[PDB]
Amino acid sequence: MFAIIETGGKQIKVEEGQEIFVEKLDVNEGDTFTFDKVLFVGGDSVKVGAPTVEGATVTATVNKQGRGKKITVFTYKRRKNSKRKKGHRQPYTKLTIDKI
Amino acid sequence: MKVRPSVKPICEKCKVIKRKGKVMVICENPKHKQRQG
Amino acid sequence: FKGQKMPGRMGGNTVTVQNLEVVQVDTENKVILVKGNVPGPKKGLVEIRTSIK
Amino acid sequence: RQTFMANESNIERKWYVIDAEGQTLGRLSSEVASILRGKNKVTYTPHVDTGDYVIVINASKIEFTGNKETDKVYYRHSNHPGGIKSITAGELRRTNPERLIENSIKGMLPSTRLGEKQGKKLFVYGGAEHPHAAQQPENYELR
Amino acid sequence: AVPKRRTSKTRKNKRRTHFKISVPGMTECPNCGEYKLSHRVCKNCGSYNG
RNA sequence: GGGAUAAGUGCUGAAAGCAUCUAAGCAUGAAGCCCCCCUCAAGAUGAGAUUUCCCAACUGGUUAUAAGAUCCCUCAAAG
RNA sequence: UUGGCACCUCGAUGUCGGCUCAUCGCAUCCUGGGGCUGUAGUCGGUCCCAAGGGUUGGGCUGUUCGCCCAUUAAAGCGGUA
RNA sequence: UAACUUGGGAGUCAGAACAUGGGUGAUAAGGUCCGUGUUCGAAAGGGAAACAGCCCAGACCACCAGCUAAGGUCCCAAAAUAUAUGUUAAGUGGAAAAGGAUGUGGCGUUGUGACACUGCGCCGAAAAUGUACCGGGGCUAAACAUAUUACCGAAGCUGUGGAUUGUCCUUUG
């Protein structure tokens, strides 16, 4: 009994009791959150998929809301005195999938 | 035996043939045989 | 290029001579007399056989 | 995220045996190289050989097309000055067919450290008898 | 000639792989009680007795 | 001395009722090709093979020992 | 080969000819195999396949090339800074 | 949705290839000189094997999402051993002429012979370290000609989140 949820312009194969990591959602720490973009459900249970299954949904607890590891964005043009350094901590939110 | 890039019948009993993908000229007068068309 | 002739260690190869003849097979002294002079030093092992030609 | 990668304990490997009678050399070699690298199976990952072991038999019976027996000179250089060697496919088919098919297939696998592992999973015999009875080889037909 | 490129301190140690010196090949003297070097006179006390 | 061949010479034969060494098919034909002759070669990691020898005492493994090879010494046909 | 251009090298890419050592191409000088000859034979001429091996020693000139001498089966033509 | 003016500040005055109109040269040159354009200069990404200038396309940053561009789908190497109809036997494809020639297909005109145009092929076709003019294997279809689909394919576009500049106030958002 898994599913495929469309969350942030990306699909995710999700089973229960699993912790998942998604782009930033507006909710705060420790909250429920219902996924509606579910395109395909069921493993050993059933195999039903439409553009969106439209009968099934998912519910997750908003476990945490943070920022990934700072990747430094460095790059340069050789012999032409041009270089550029940036930083980036892409923000994420981690969720526990409570029910399907 | 003439080996030149233009074989054409000289006297009216010389006949053009092919052999091994080469254009030959068989002829009774033995001067008149040619190949490499 | 490989095969360029350069200084290095010389001699010691397994060389073969051919078409020698047998002047005399001295039995009871157990020697053979061959026409010529064969590879190897004195006391050097030599294997004699019949010509391949 | 989630993308299954093949490990040493995930992988399986199977034994196939393909008649090389009546097949064009390259039309068969492509199929065989596909099998060797291992992308007939869904657990394909690049950094490991999830492919199979293959036993090509009847290598003294492959067919060329057109004037390729007398043409199609195989060359090889000995790295000595001026020493280049040659052999036509007709003379390599009667003298050593098990090198004909091997060279065809191994030119279609990558030249890497893992491509040589896969390169030495090919077992080519000129004949109908292969000594790998103890391996449970399977039939295989050209897809 | 002169070196075209300075030698790493890896290639150096590889080349000095064989810069060992073996032990001498010694034994113990049955008379002196101590280590001598084989086929030599005993350093400590006297005799060879060979 | 062979086996396959280049130029070459053909033999049979239609395409083309004939002619035709060629398309099917079959012969012959070079100091040249591959052999044969000489050597090196299993690090040929595709690591081949034949013969002979050796093989026990304790705690999952280890030990010294065996057959064997050396350290050390006298040397040269080797360096 | 004689040139044309001026693209690399002027904080350096050393000249011609010999000596040592060669290696490659074939547009073959000899030796091997053929066709045609205005090829009687010997001896040739001109094409065709062929690169396995061989291809001299002196005089004169810095000399290369070049002429001469005495032979040879032959005294090849080129590339590799 | 730029333009001009008046001010402060500069840099540039060695240009290159590609297409094209010319001069010069020899209807030589990656030659040289000018008109027009593009790119490089100062431009990363994909294709051309490798390759500033060739074809596609302009990188704010993250993403293990989707759609296309030149170019491609037998294997190396992602996606058609797709589809319908024909041509080519040379490995042509995958270096080159004058000229030669019962190669072969189309089409038309002609008295089984002869002809004009044509499609694709053959010969002409010889160089030096090593095959060595498809990138390699290999190919008789995995080559050509015309038409249908599918798909792969970029840092292009889209989706999501984020960061700085702006302009409009729906509601200073």
Side-chain angles (χ1 to χ4, degrees), chain D residues 39-97:
Chain D
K39 57 174 66 178
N40 300 121
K41 58 174 65 63
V42 179
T43 57
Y44 175 79
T45 65
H47 60 278
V48 297
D49 58 353
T50 58
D52 296 335
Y53 291 144
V54 176
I55 305 168
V56 174
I57 57 170
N58 292 113
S60 295
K61 301 290 190 288
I62 52 89
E63 293 290 328
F64 293 96
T65 56
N67 288 316
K68 286 184 181 176
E69 186 268 326
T70 60
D71 303 331
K72 183 65 179 294
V73 180
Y74 295 101
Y75 302 102
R76 70 184 181 277
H77 201 277
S78 62
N79 299 116
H80 290 272
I84 185 164
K85 277 72 180 169
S86 303
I87 186 66
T88 59
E91 290 170 348
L92 187 66
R93 188 178 63 241
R94 73 182 69 181
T95 307
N96 190 354

Side-chain angles (χ1 to χ4, degrees), chain D residues 11-23:
Chain D
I11 296 169
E12 50 90 22
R13 291 191 187 94
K14 299 294 182 179
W15 285 84
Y16 297 103
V17 56
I18 179 64
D19 276 326
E21 285 183 354
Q23 292 305 115

Side-chain angles (χ1 to χ4, degrees), chain E residues 12-42:
Chain E
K12 180 178 74 175
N13 293 313
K14 290 179 180 180
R15 185 182 64 241
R16 299 181 187 181
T17 296
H18 290 283
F19 196 68
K20 293 181 176 291
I21 62 166
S22 69
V23 293
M26 62 187 178
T27 61
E28 282 190 353
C29 182
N31 196 0
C32 300
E34 303 293 326
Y35 283 96
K36 75 175 182 68
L37 190 59
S38 65
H39 294 96
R40 270 72 172 176
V41 169
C42 183

Side-chain angles (χ1 to χ4, degrees), chain A residues 34-73:
Chain A
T34 58
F35 289 106
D36 293 330
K37 299 300 289 184
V38 53
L39 286 76
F40 186 87
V41 301
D44 58 358
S45 62
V46 303
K47 286 77 64 179
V48 58
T52 59
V53 67
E54 80 185 1
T57 53
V58 175
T59 303
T61 298
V62 176
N63 187 358
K64 183 175 172 63
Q65 178 183 0
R67 294 170 70 195
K69 303 293 183 181
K70 182 188 284 290
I71 65 171
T72 188
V73 180

Side-chain angles (χ1 to χ4, degrees), chain A residues 12-20 95-97, chain D residues 1-2:
Chain A
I12 297 168
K13 187 182 79 67
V14 63
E15 295 180 357
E16 72 276 15
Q18 182 187 3
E19 289 180 356
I20 58 175
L95 274 66
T96 293
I97 297 298
Chain D
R1 300 298 305 278
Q2 56 266 10

Side-chain angles (χ1 to χ4, degrees), chain A residues 6-11 23-24 26 71 73 77 80 82 84 86-88 90-91:
Chain A
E6 175 176 0
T7 68
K10 289 186 258 76
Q11 277 83 21
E23 290 182 356
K24 188 167 81 71
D26 294 334
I71 65 171
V73 180
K77 297 285 184 179
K80 312 294 182 288
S82 180
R84 184 178 63 87
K86 304 294 287 186
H88 188 74
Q90 179 60 31

Side-chain angles (χ1 to χ4, degrees), chain D residues 29 32-33 36 56 100-109 122:
Chain D
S29 296
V32 176
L36 288 171
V56 174
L100 181 68
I101 291 89
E102 291 185 355
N103 291 123
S104 296
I105 294 168
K106 289 183 181 179
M108 295 182 183
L109 296 170
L122 184 65

